[PDB]
């Protein structure tokens, strides 16, 4: 069971960052906005005001 779960964390970088999100939430708000913003900008969405 341990070998399977370690392998799963080494292959999926996005899941590793997900697991670090709560750390960013309590330490660095700017980083949290940045990390989540970079991932949203990359996704082109034309916001109308």
């Amino acid at each position: 069971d341990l070998q399977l779960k370690r392998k799963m964390l080494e292959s999926n970088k996005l899941q590793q960052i997900e697991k670090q999100l709560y750390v960013y939430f309590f330490q660095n708000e700017e980083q949290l906005k940045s990390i989540v913003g970079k991932l949203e900008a990359q996704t082109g969405g034309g916001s109308s005001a």
Binding site: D1, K5, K19, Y22, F25, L32, V36, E40
Partner: protein, 51 residues
């Protein structure tokens, strides 16, 4: 059995759901995670990259 419990705690990290009302940048952690999950899912849809 105890070692199995420890392995489980390491994988789920339950301490992230312990403060729900705490807002940072006008949003809760859950909201942030949700934003993350939507963004990750949008990226995965664009990047044909069928997960």
């Amino acid at each position: 059995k105890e070692v199995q419990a420890t392995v489980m705690d390491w994988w789920e990290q339950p301490v992230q759901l312990c403060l729900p009302s705490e807002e940072r940048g006008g949003l809760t952690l859950r909201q942030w995670r949700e934003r993350w999950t939507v963004a990750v899912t949008a990226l995965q849809r664009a990047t044909g990259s069928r997960s």
